Subunit: 334 residues, 6 copies
Amino acid sequence: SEMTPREIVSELDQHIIGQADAKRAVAIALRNRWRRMQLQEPLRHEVTPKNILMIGPTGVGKTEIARRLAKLANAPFIKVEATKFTVGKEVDSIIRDLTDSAMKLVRQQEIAKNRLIDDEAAKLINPEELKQKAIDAVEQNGIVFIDEIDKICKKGEYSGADVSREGVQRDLLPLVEGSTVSTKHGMVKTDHILFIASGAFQVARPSDLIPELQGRLPIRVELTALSAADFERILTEPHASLTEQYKALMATEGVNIAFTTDAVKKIAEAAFRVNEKTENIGARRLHTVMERLMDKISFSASDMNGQTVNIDAAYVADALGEVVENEDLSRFIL
Amino acid sequence: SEMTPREIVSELDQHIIGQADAKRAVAIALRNRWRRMQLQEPLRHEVTPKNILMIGPTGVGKTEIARRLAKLANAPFIKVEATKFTVGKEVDSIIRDLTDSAMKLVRQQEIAKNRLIDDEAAKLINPEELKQKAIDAVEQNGIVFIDEIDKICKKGEYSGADVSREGVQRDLLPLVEGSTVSTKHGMVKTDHILFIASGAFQVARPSDLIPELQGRLPIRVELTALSAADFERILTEPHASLTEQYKALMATEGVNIAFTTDAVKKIAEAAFRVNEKTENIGARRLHTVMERLMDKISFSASDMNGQTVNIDAAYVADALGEVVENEDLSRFIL
Amino acid sequence: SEMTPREIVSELDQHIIGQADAKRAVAIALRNRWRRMQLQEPLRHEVTPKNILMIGPTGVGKTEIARRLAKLANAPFIKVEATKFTVGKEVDSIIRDLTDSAMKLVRQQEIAKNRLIDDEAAKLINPEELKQKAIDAVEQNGIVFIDEIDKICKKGEYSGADVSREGVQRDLLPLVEGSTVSTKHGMVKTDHILFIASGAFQVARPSDLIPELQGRLPIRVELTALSAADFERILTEPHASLTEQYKALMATEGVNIAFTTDAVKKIAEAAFRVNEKTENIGARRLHTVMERLMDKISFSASDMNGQTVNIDAAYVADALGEVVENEDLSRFIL
Amino acid sequence: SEMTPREIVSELDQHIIGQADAKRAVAIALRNRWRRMQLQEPLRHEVTPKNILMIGPTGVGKTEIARRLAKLANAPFIKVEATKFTVGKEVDSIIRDLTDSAMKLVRQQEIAKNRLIDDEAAKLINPEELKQKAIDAVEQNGIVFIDEIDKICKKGEYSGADVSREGVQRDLLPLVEGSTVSTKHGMVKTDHILFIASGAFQVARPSDLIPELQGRLPIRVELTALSAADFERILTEPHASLTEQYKALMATEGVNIAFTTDAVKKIAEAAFRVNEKTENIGARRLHTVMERLMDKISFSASDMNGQTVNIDAAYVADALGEVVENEDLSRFIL
Amino acid sequence: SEMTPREIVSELDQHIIGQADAKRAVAIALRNRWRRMQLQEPLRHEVTPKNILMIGPTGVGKTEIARRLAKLANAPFIKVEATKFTVGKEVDSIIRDLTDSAMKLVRQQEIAKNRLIDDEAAKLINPEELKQKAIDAVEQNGIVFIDEIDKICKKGEYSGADVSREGVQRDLLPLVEGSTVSTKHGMVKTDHILFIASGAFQVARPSDLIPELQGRLPIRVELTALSAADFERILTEPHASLTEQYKALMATEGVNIAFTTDAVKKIAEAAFRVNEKTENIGARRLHTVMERLMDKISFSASDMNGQTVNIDAAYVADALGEVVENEDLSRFIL
Amino acid sequence: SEMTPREIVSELDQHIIGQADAKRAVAIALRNRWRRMQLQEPLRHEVTPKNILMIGPTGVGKTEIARRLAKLANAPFIKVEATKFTVGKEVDSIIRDLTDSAMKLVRQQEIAKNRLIDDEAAKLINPEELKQKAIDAVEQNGIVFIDEIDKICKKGEYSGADVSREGVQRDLLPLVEGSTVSTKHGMVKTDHILFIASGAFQVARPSDLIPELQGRLPIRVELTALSAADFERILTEPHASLTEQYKALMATEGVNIAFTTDAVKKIAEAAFRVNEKTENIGARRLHTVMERLMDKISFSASDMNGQTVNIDAAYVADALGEVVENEDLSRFIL
Ligand SMILES: Nc1ncnc2c1ncn2[C@@H]1O[C@H](COP(=O)(O)OP(=O)(O)O)[C@@H](O)[C@H]1O
């Protein structure tokens, strides 16, 4: 898009708390596409996407940053899990699924951008028109998110699976290097598709990836663990935060809810407490804690039409009970 | 549907004895769909289904609650066994089978809702009409029941199958996270499909599921073991209970049967006795015990037209004989 | 059909010697279909087939009872071996093959039930007419015989194959529980298909089957070993018995044969003697013994037109020679 | 055919030396088809083919007897190796290949039996005409030869392959028991297809085959080893014997050859000598010995037009040299 | 093409630094095609391509020389990883993918070489016209690059994979020897396709390849390791070098950058330093170092419109910081 | 063809040096086809091809003799590697690929044998015309070369692969025995296809092949190792020898080269020296040595237009340097 790096980050800031480095890395990556378009031949086709490799713990915004990025750029997105390819599925599926994603994007945008009348829905839908467009979207703005790419790295005492793993990287090369893949909508060039690979790299390191693949993931960026304070912001700041979602849902029932300031600190404190006591699943822990919290009101909201319900610290401690501190309970409920 | 949580539970109560927590959890889940529909963009598409994970022993109503739920909501249902995916079958089959289920639902409802005349059965059946409808049903009201999801959790001394198991969870992610799957009726978005996963979690715990999947199963609910008293109610209270079924079947033969109060306690006592002496298969034990009980009358009902047969405690003890107390017999017969 | 349990058993008696319990179990099962049809909604669709599990030694009439049952009911039958499913074949094949079987049944019955003229064979054969009929036959009267279902039960020191075995039961569930399967003739509901599972259960017990599958095989019935006296009756009583078959075959050659009373006792005595001395293969042993007996006359019948040949005890002892008592010979010849 | 057992054996005698028992067994089997056709319903469809199991060493005429049998009966034949089925191929292929074989038989017989003119080759070739005919041939006269069926028998220390082997027998059951298989020419009933199974049964015995399969191979017959005297007859008596073939081939070159009486004894003596000194491959040994013998004359026959060449004992000893007695040479050359 | 060896090398020199031997080997190979075309039958079809085997370390120009070669010759190129073939993929895919590559080359060249007007894009696009052309391109000028062919060589303690590896070479033979492969565009002869195989041959040697394959890789050539001085030239001399690319990208932002002489020595010194301290990935190391260097300016270039930025030694040392010397950092960042 | 054995060998002599026995064996084999055609029914179809098994070291002319044979007979050829079949590929592929080969042969011969005019290329190309012809070529003159057939023989300590190997022979039987295979051009009878199997038989012997397959490879012939003197002749005598090829290639550049008598002895001496010092790859060694020799002149020929270059002993010793005697070098370069 015509958006500048800072404008892209400003947009990302409204959905993702923190992770400024990753926000900048993807902003740059998206801006480069615009820059390349301002170039002239023969340097235009020589310049390829600077794929990004995100390094960070689980549930801190890696995928979300990528999803959001694709959203604000109005581009075809696709998430895939690396280990998925170690019969089975062929990597080309990635580009295939991605072209489908591009179809919806093109369809809903075409038919909508041109308005009993159902029998006259065509008059714009040219079988070749849409196919070339979907292809065009994928070839020029396609974004592929490759999760757990650190799990296809040679682990310890190599050989056995470390032969199958590297085979996955190997099979990914044609895609990140620039290949032509066949899809039900025609051929697709992967040359300018932006690739975002992710991994925790707890044991494995990026230098463990086969060399041909390291060179195709030039941009290395780290995402940080989230703090209780971060959970606090996430709960209320991002567009469509959990508190805003629940507030809107109860409203359809005639119930007006409100979270006091400390009730939010309490919720975030609960999530962070379970992650550090058991397994840290990051921001995701916020989902179960909120559901546990909104359990009761969610079920009986229909019987409280016209009421305002204040969810304060007391309400939160009541709803959570002994769950947070008792692993026997938390490992089931949260 | 327009049904409120309490109305949904009231309906569930007429088919399932007990399990109030699970009945509430699914009621909420179904009501949320209605609520989301009352929202406005851009918060409407941001709100996703709060998938449910049922935790409980075998044969206590987990699936039945899900089946019934789909029934009362007039929605496409599909049951699948997790371990089924560890060539083989691809998870997308789930969404494929589910779209077929949606086809029948749409067909039988369309042709019926619009009435020699066989050659004029069309005049409503538009190849595109039904396909978009079936797709619409699945995308907006689809319900998937994933049984034994605790068997695809990393067991002990991980690795070997614990690599294949988690691969299943991994492959399930795109579905529970929101993917587009191709089906003979067109593309299908799984974004708003309600997922109900089930497991006994005797050894494994929900916290053992990969994190990306925990976050997509926010609602955790427990189902309880059933008591002899519960078996008692099940035998006669639910719509189409076993006693009501047998009574109606014998009636077609001209035989009027009746179960005395204690005969029912005796039947339920027998089932509960075998489950606690051998393997507890819950309510299912009621099927074999009833068949053993109705064996004789079922075969000769044709020769008793016009008779009323009272099945009392004595009749039950006679029909069961030594089966209940002799494992050598019970493990074959019941 | 409109046939009563006793009428069904009377018919079965003319093909199968003994096994009264199994004859009654299948009679009941077939009668239930008629009964369910006399019911009214919504109890009509709630009542499902009471599948049968036959427990008994090999070659005593399990399959034959099922084959015959399908015959007298004019219904689509299909036999399948359980272990067959442990790439490979998918259980849906069962329903697919079963629908084909239903096609022949419908075709031969339609074209025949409506009578140079070859070019006018149509005028009734409507591509949609037959397909809906075949589907209808399978959905309403389909019968599936699942042999060796005890071989897919967890054996000893479980795990290894006991994981693959139970997977088979698991994959069978959708069929016995009620699923929709796609076939070249359209979709097929397995909801009202009657399932008859068989097994010797020498080591494994029915209680070893996964619980979901036990509940779907409510009727447990035992078949007994056959005696020399039973072999005696089988040789001459059932319609199309072996003696009647051979008598009719030789007659086409102009040869009239007759078995004296003791010649039959001798034949049955021979079969029973080999089964108890080596491996008991039940009634099947009667096939080889009869062939050994009719060997000579069968070859030269063409040269004996106009003759009556009396097969007496002496003839039988001559034809059999030392085979019965010498395992070295019997294990090759019989 | 209308041929009697003795007429069938007389025909077989002109192609196969010895093996009177096997010749009689297949004659009977083929005659039974005719007999069954003389029967009336409902005994007609009840009578099934008496499949044959041939027991004997390699290269003594088992397959040849079956090939010839199919020839003289003008029926679709197909040879298959059992172990072939232990992805891979599905047994149904057998019936598929067999239907193709039936196509050629029907085509060449139809177009031929009805006579620039190439553009008028049709006027008889009705796409449905031939397909129903080919189907008819296979269903009524099809013959399947199953070689090495003793290799799919449970060997020693069962389990491992003895599980896969018996699976083959299991998968063969539907075919020998009577199934319907789909083929590019339509559905095919295997009910009346005659099956001839073969095996050396050196270690395994027929009683080792699963019981369901023993019963479907009622006729057991043994083929004997061949003697030097048998090799002697084979070399010159059967239609298209090796000597007759070579005599006709050299004649096209203008060379008249003749084998003296003792030259033939010498050739047969050589073959029998190598089989008993190394590995006995039966009659097949006659192929290599004849080729070694005719090597020289075969190459230079073109330069001997007009000559009569007498192949006598001296010629044979010359051509064979030291090959027969030197295993180092015989294992390469013969 | 009509280009002479020296003209081809002169062209290669503008993209690849060093590697004169490999540049000559491919120049010769490409010139031979022209020479063969000047020959007359029957010597014309007897002369086959002198395939090349490149021996050298990773990231020194093996693939690039091949890519460039295909470019300057306007020929269909395809890169493939040998181990990729050890279900899976069939080598024929190589020729299939290669024919697709040839399609784009032909299309873009045809429609372009012949010029509202969109509905009149045809008038040249003959379905058969393009297919025969694409086929023609592949058959006459096709170039296949087979990477890591030394990994399919029998390693140590042969057998296990050394059986699968050599199978790959075996399956490659038909292609390098001259085969006909089927593709969606028709049949394709691989007879005159130039094959370039590559490998590091650190342990394995060319003499380890199966003999049939050695003979089809007649030209053996070595590529050398690159020096810091080479990295220096690569950074600025080749067309579309990294410095030229970055200069052009920033220019679209209104930023004029310039690298001082020593800044370039510093960049090349950094890359060479990391390769010799950790893992030598050759020229590829230049990608990560440049990205690390241009990180800051790349993100904020939009805010520096109108500025000239001099990237000198100081700027480079600043941007790199401690990364180069700290393996803990370099293995993540570079 | 009408060619006599001696005429066929005379033709083979102009392409293959030595191997008189193998040349005679294939000449005979090809002549037999002609002879069989001179026969009358019913002996005509009884006579089958005398398949050949070639026994000899690698690179001595086995394949070449077969290729050439197919050439001079204008017949469809196909080379296949036995171990290729141990999912994977099915032997029928052999007959399929062979029918394609037959298509080209028929096409290029038909369209050529019958002559702006491009739009009038048809008027002879009848879709059925060519298909029946290609089929006819394969059925009557098809030649299949089966390399490494000694690698599918039971090795040592049989079982493991010796079960898979023999399975290959087993699957080959239907082809060599006479089967019907389906191909995109119609059905194909393999009855008269000539099969040439090859192997080094260093450890395994022909007597190790399963008996059914020995009998179908009646003609056993040995090929000898080649001497330095043989290499000498090969370099210059065969049509399209290496020296003749290089002479013609340089001529297109304006360069006239000539090899002195001793220069040729020197080249052949070099090849033979490397084969006996390292691994003997036979005549193939001549390819690398010639390329090493012609390296320099081949690259600069363009700059020597008008020159005569005499390649004498001195030139050869110069070009080869230390390669021949230094295994470290020879195993890379030659
Ligand atoms: N609470 C209950 N109320 C009514 N019926 C029940 C209940 N629990 C079990 N059943 C009966 O027992 C069977 C149990 O299967 P299901 O409900 O799927 O549970 P589970 O998944 O634990 O086996 C069903 O056929 C149902 O009719």
